[PDB]
Coordinates of C-alpha atoms and ligand atoms in Angstrom, one line a residue:
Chain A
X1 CA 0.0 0.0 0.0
X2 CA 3.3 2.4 0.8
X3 CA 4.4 4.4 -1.9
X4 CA 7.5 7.1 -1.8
X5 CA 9.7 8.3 0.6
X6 CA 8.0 5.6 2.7
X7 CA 7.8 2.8 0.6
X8 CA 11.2 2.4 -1.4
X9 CA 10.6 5.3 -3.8
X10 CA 7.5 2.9 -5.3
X11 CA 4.5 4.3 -7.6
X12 CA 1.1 3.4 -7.8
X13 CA -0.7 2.2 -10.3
X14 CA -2.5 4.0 -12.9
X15 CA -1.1 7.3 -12.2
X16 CA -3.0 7.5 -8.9
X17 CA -1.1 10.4 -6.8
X18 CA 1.2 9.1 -3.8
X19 CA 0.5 11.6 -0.7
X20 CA 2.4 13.3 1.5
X21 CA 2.3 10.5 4.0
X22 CA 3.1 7.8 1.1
X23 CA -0.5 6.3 0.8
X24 CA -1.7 5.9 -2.9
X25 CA -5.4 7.6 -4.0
X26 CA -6.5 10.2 -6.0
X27 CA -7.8 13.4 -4.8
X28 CA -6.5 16.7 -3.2
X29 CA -5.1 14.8 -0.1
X30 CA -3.1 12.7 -2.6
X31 CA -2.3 15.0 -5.6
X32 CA -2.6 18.3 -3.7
X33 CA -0.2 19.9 -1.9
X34 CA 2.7 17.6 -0.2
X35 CA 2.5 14.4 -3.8
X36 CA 5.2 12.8 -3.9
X37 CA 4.9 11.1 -7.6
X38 CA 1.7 9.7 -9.9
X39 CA -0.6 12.7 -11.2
X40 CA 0.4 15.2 -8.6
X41 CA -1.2 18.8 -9.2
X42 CA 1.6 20.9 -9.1
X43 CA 4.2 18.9 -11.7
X44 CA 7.5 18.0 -10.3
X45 CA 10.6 19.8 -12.0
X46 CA 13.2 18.0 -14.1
X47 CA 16.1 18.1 -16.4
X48 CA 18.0 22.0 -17.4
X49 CA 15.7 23.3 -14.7
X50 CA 16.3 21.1 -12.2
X51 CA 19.5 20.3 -12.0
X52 CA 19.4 17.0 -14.1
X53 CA 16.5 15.3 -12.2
X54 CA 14.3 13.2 -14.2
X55 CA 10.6 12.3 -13.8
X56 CA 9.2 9.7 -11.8
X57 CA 6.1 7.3 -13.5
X58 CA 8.2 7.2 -17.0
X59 CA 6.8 10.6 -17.6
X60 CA 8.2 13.3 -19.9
X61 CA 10.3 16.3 -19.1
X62 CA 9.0 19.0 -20.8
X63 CA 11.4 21.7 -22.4
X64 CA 10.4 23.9 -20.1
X65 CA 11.6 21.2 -17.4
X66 CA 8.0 19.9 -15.9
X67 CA 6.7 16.4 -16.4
X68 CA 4.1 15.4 -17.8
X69 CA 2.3 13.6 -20.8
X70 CA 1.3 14.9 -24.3
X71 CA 2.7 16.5 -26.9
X72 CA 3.6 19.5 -25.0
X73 CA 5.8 17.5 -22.6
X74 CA 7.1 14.5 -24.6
X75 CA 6.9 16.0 -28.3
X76 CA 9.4 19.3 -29.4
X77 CA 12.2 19.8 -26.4
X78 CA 11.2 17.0 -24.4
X79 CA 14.4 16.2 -22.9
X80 CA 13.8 12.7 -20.8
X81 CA 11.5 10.1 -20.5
X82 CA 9.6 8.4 -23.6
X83 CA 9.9 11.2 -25.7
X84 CA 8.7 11.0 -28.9
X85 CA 12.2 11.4 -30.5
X86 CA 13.8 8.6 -30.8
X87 CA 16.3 8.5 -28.5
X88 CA 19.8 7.2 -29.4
X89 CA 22.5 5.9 -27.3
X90 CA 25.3 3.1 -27.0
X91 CA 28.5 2.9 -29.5
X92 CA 26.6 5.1 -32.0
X93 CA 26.3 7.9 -29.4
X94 CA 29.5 8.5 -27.4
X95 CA 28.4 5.5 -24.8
X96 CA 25.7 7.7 -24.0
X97 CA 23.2 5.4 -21.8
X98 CA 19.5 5.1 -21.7
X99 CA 17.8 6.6 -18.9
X100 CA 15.7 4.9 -16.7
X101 CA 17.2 1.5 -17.2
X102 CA 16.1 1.3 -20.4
X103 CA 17.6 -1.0 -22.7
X104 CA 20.2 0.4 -25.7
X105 CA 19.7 -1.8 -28.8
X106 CA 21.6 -3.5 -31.3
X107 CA 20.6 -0.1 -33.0
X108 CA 21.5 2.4 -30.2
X109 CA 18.1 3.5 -29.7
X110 CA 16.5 3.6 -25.9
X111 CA 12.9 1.3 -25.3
X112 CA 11.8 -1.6 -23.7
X113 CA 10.7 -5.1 -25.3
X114 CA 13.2 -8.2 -26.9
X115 CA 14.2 -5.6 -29.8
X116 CA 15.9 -3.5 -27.4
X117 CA 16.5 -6.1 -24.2
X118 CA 17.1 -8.7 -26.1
X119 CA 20.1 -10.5 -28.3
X120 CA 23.0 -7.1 -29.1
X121 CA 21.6 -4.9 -26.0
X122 CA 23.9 -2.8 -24.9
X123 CA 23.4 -1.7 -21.5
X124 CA 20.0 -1.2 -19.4
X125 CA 17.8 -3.9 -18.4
X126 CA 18.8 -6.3 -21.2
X127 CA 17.9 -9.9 -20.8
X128 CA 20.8 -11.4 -22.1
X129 CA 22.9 -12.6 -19.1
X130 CA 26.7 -11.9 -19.3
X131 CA 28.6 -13.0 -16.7
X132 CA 30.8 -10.5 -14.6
X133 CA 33.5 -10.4 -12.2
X134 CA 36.4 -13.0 -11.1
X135 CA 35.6 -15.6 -12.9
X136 CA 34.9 -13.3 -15.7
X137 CA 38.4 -11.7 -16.6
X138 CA 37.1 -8.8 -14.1
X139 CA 34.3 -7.5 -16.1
X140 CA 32.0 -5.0 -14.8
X141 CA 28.4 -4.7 -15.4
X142 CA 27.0 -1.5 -17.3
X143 CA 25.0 0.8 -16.0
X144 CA 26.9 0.5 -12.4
X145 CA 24.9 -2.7 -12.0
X146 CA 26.3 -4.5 -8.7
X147 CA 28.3 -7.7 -10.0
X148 CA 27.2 -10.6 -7.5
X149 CA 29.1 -13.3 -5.7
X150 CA 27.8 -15.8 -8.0
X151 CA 29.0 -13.1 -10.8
X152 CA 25.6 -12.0 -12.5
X153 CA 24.7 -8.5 -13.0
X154 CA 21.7 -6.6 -10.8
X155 CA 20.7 -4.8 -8.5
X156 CA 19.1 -6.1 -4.8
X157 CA 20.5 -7.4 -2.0
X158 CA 21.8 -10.7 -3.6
X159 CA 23.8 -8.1 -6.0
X160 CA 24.9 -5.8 -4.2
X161 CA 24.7 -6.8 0.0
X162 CA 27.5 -9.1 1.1
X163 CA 29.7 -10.7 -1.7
X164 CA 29.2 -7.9 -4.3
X165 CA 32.0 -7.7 -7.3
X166 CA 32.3 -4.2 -8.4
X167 CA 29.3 -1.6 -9.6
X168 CA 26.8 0.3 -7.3
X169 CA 27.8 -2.1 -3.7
X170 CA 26.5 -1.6 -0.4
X171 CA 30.4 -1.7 1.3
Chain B
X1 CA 6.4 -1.6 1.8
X2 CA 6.0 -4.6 -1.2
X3 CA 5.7 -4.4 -5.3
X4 CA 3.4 -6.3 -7.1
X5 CA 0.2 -8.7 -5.7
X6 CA 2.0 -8.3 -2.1
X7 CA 1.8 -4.2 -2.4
X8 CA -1.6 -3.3 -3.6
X9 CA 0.2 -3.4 -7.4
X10 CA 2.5 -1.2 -6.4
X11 CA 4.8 -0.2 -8.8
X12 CA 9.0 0.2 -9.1
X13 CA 10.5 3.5 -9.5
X14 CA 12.7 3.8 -12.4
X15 CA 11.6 0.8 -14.7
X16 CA 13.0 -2.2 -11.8
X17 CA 11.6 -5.3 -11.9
X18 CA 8.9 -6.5 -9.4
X19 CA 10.4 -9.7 -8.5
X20 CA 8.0 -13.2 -7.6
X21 CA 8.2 -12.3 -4.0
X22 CA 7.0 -8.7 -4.1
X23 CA 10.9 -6.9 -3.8
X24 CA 12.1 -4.4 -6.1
X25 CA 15.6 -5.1 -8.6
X26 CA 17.3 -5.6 -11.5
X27 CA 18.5 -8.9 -13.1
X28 CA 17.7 -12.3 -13.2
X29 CA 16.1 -12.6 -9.6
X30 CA 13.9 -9.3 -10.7
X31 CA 13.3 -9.7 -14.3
X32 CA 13.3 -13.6 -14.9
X33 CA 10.5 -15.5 -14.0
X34 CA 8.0 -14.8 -11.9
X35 CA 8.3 -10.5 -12.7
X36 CA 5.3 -8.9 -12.1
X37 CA 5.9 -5.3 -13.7
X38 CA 8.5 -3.0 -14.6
X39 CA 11.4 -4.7 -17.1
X40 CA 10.7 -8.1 -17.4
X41 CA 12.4 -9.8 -19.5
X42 CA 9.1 -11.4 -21.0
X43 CA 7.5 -8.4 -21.9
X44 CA 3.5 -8.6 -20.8
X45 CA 0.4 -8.8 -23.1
X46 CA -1.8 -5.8 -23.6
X47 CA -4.3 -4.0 -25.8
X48 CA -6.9 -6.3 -28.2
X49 CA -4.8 -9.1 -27.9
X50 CA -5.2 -9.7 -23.9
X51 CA -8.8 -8.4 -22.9
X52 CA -8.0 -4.8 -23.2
X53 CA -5.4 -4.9 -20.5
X54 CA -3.1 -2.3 -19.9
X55 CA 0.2 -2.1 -19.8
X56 CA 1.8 -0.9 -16.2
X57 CA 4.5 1.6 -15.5
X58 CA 2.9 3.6 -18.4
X59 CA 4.9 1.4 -21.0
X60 CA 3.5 1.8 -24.7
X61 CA 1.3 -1.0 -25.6
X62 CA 2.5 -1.6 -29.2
X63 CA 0.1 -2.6 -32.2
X64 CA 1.2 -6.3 -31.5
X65 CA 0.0 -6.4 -27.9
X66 CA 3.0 -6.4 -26.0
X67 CA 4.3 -3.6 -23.8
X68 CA 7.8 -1.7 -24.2
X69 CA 9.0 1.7 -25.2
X70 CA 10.9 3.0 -28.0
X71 CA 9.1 3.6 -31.9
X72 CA 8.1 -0.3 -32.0
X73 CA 5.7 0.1 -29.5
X74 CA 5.0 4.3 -29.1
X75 CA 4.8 4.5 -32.5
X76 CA 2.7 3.4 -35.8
X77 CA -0.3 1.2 -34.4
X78 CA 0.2 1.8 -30.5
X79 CA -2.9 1.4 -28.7
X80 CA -1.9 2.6 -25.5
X81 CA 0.4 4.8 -23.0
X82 CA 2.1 7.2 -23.8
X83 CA 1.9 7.0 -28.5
X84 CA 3.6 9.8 -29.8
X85 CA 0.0 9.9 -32.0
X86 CA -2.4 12.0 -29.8
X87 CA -5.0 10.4 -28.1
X88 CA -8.5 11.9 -28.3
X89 CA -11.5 12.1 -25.4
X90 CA -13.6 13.7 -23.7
X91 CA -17.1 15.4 -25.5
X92 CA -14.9 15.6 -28.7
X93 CA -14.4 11.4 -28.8
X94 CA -17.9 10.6 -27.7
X95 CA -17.3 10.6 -24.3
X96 CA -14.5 8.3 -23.8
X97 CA -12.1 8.4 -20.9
X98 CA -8.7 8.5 -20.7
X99 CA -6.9 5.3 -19.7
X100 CA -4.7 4.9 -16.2
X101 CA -6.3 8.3 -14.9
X102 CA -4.9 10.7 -17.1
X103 CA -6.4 13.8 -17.6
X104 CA -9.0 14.7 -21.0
X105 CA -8.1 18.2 -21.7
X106 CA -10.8 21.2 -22.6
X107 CA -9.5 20.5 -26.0
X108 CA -10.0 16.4 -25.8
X109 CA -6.6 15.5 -25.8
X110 CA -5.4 12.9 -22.9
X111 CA -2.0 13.7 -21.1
X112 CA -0.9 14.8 -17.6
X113 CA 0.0 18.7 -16.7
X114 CA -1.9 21.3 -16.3
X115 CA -2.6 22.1 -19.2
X116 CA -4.5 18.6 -19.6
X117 CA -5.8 18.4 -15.7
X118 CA -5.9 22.3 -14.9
X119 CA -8.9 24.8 -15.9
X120 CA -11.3 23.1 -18.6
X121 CA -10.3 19.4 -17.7
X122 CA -13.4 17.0 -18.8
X123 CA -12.3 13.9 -17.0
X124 CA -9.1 11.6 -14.9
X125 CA -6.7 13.5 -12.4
X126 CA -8.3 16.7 -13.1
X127 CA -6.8 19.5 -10.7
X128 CA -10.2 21.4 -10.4
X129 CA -11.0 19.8 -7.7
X130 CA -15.3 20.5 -8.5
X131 CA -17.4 20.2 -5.6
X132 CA -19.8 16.5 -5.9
X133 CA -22.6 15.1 -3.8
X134 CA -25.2 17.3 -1.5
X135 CA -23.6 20.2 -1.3
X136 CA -23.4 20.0 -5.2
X137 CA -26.8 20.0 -6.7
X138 CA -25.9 16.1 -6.4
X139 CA -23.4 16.0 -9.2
X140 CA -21.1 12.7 -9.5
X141 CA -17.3 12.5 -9.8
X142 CA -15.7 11.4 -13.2
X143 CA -14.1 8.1 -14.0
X144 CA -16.4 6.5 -10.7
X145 CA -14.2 8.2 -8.3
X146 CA -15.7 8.5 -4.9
X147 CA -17.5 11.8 -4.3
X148 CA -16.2 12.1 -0.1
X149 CA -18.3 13.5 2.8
X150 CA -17.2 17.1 2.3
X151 CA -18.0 16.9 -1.4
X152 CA -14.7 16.6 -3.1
X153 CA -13.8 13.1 -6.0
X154 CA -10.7 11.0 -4.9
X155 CA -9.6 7.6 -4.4
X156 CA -8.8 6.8 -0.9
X157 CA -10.4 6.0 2.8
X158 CA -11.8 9.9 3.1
X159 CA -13.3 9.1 -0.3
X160 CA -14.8 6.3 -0.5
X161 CA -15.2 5.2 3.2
X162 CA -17.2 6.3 6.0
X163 CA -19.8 9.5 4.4
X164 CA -19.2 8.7 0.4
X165 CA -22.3 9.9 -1.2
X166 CA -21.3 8.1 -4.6
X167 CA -19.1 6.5 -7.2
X168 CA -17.1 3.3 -6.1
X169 CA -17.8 3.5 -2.5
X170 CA -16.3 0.7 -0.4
Ligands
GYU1 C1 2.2 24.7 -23.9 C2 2.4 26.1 -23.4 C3 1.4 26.5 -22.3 N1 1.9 25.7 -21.1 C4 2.7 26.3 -20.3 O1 3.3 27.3 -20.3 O2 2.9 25.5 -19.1 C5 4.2 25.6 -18.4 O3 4.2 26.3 -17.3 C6 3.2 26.0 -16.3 C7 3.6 26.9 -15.2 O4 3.4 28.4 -15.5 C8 3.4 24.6 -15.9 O5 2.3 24.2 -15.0 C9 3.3 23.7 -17.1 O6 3.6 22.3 -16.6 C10 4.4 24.0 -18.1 N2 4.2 23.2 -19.2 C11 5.2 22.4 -19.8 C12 4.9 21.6 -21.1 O7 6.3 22.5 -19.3
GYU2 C1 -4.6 25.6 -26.8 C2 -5.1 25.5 -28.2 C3 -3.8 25.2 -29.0 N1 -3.2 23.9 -28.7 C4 -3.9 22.8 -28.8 O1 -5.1 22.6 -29.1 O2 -3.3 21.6 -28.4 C5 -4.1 20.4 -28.3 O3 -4.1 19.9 -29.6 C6 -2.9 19.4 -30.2 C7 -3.4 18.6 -31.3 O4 -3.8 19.6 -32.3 C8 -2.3 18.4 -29.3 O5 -1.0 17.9 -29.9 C9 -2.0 19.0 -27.9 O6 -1.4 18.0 -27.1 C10 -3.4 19.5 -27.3 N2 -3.1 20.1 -26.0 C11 -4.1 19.9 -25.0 C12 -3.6 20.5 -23.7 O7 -5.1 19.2 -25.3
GYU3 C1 14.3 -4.1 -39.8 C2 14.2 -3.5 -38.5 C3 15.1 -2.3 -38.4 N1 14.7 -1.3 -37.4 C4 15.5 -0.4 -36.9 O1 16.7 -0.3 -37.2 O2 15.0 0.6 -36.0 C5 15.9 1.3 -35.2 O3 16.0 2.6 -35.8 C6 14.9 3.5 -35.9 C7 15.4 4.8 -36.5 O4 15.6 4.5 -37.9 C8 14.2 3.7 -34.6 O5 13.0 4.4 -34.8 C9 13.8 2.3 -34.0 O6 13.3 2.3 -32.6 C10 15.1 1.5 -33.8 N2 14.8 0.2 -33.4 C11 15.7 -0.3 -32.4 C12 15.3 -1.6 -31.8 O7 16.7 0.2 -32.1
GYU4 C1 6.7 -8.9 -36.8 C2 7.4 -7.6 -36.6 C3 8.8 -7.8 -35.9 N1 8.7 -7.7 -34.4 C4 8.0 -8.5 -33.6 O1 7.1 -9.2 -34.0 O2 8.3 -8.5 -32.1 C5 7.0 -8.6 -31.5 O3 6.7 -10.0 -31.1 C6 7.6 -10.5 -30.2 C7 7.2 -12.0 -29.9 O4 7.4 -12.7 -31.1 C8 7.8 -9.8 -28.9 O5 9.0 -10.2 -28.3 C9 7.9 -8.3 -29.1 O6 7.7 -7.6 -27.8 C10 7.0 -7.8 -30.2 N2 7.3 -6.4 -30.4 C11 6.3 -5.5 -30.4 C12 6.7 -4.2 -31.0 O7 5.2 -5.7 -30.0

């Protein structure tokens, strides 16, 4: 039922507004003042504007640096999220990554789904399962993933707790 | 405190895997079997092809069914999330709502903003925050949200517990 600050940084469902106290609804005592993420009232800030910050809920930063959905937020300017642009990164783009752990194709384009997760993904949450670490001539995951004892690439405790390789590691 | 079945469908920040047992991650643990949203590496059934489902995380639900990001599925034949096509509503579609609660704009376009949920929003998480119920002339919330004892929609105890007046009251 916790959502937020007091639940892990989760989102609800649907879009439904997570309050000030981290309980998912819909509502002015949800998406009034205090939301935290889904369809708050006032839109959270991102990108240029905000120092870099992206949205929350795979919305789109606006150029004017709000997020949202629509064309006036993912269409002309939008500069994260599912914009309508394609959205390029991997060896054709500098090793530029995909944000929100999407997966960089074969192509180097950002998305989600077996043409981008699948076999010649780059980095993000690709399915293909490359071993890292010690037994793996020291290879590090992308994305900062946490390398595992067992020398797979994720992130949770059994990635990054005790036993962790290299990447994003508790200690 | 949970993702998934064991959080009230709760949802990962940042497109992580809902693991079998309700946790939040990234790899095979998270995105193998047993994923119940975010990246899972069996991408989930939507649109015509599964009941009219949605897709969660507001992922595209491509013309195929299936639900991703990127031109494959936001582009030609998406049926759902955020398309790059605009999505029409609202008086100017025949009434239809908006899916996953976004807002119908005065102009019947669906998105989230205030442009879309501020002044002139027909339908979803509409900002306006118009008075329902007694104190109304009897008028009922949008979407069956719960019209609370104070005459303001939401979803939530205050709205549809104790003193609702109408739309999906507990
Ligand atoms: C499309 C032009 C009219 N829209 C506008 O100025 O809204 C901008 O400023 C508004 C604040 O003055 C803010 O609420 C809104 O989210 C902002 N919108 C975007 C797309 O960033
Ligand atoms: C304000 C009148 C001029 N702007 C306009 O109609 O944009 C609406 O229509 C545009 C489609 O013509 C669509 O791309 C855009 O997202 C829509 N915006 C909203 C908030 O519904
Ligand atoms: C025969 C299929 C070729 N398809 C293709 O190269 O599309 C890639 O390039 C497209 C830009 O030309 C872009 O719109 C699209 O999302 C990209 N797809 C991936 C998975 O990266
Ligand atoms: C026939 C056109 C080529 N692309 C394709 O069918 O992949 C589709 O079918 C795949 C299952 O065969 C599934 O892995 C994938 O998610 C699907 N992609 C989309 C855009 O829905």
């Amino acid at each position: 039922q916790r959502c937020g600050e007091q639940g892990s940084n989760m989102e609800c469902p649907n879009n439904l507004c997570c309050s000030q106290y981290g309980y998912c609804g819909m509502g002015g005592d949800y998406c009034g003042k205090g939301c935290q993420n889904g369809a708050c009232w006032t839109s959270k800030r991102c990108g240029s504007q905000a120092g870099g910050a992206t949205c929350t809920n795979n919305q789109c930063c606006s150029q004017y640096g709000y997020c949202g959905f629509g064309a006036e937020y993912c269409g002309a300017g939008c500069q994260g999220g599912p914009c309508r642009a394609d959205i390029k990164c991997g060896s054709q783009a500098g090793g530029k990554l995909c944000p929100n752990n999407l997966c960089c194709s074969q192509w180097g384009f950002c998305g989600l789904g077996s043409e981008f997760c699948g076999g010649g993904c780059q980095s993000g949450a690709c399915s293909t399962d490359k071993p890292c670490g010690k037994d793996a001539g020291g290879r590090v995951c992308t994305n900062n993933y946490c390398c595992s004892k067992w020398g797979s690439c994720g992130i949770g405790p059994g990635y990054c707790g005790a036993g962790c390789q290299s990447g994003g590691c508790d200690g």
